[PDB]
Assembly symmetry: C3
Homo-oligomer: 114 residues x 3
């Protein structure tokens, strides 16, 4: 699984260790080993949510499986929770796009997961 | 809806008010309230289009519905028009990927839109 | 086609001409004309892969067709090869998401490819 956060929060406001905390919690939520979790945080972005520039985030979570209506609700609670507690972004200024990737459509280590 | 522009145009060339303009014009084009529209502009990127580093943009529009053949033609006319007029990017150096997102696959405010 | 590379490798480590090399090799691999190939390289990112901040990359390749099990295996070999050789990123620290885009869902030059 791979989780990307794009935010207008500045770099200095991303706490030390936040990528590990994401890695860990994403591992627990998806059931996948942490070795397979990738995280990418993009601060200082020029962005707007609902027409204003208070803290916000545009995110994506891609996974081979473990994506669905109940699981995504749970992920959104977890990830909005973390964004609120660590980056101080209100949950109502966060979008998270979920993508259930086919194994044949993810490349890694010179081939695909298929 | 969420609209992302990635471009090699420099930051100083993005006009003041461009994110509000995009918010307003996308609210109008999609019919959605502006409170639900998110916009993200990423200048100064290292990019090429047809191998050239002349001005270009790679964009995405993600929405729960309001995506389809005729709508997307209309969005492309709108958005290429805005990128040409405001950022001086030729329409033939713009790509916009459209995504019709399932409500169950968009997280927001601690849950999904489902 | 559009190929995006996000990496923690620093900008100074991206060799001169790397975007052209990608454009050329992608054209040959996908069979698509080079004029239609867009490339985007984002260095200096804040990321983790398996929890570690050792060199890594999160990538995407979008194309109208030419996406499939065998093709994607071939692309992954090619692109991991290039990331290893040019950016010194281990293939096992690279994820590439593949997207077969509907023509009606790609905007370009004021319209779509449909």
């Amino acid at each position: 699984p791979m989780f990307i956060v794009n935010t207008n929060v500045p770099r200095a406001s991303v706490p030390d260790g936040f990528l590990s905390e994401l890695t860990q919690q994403l591992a627990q939520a998806t059931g996948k080993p942490p070795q397979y979790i990738a995280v990418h945080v993009v601060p200082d972005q020029l962005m707007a949510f609902g027409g204003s520039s208070e803290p916000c985030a545009l995110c994506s979570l891609h996974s081979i499986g473990k994506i669905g209506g109940a699981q995504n609700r749970s992920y959104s609670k977890l990830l909005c929770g973390l964004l609120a507690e660590r980056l101080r972004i209100s949950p109502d200024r966060v979008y998270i796009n979920y993508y259930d990737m086919n194994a044949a459509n993810v490349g890694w280590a010179n081939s695909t997961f298929a």
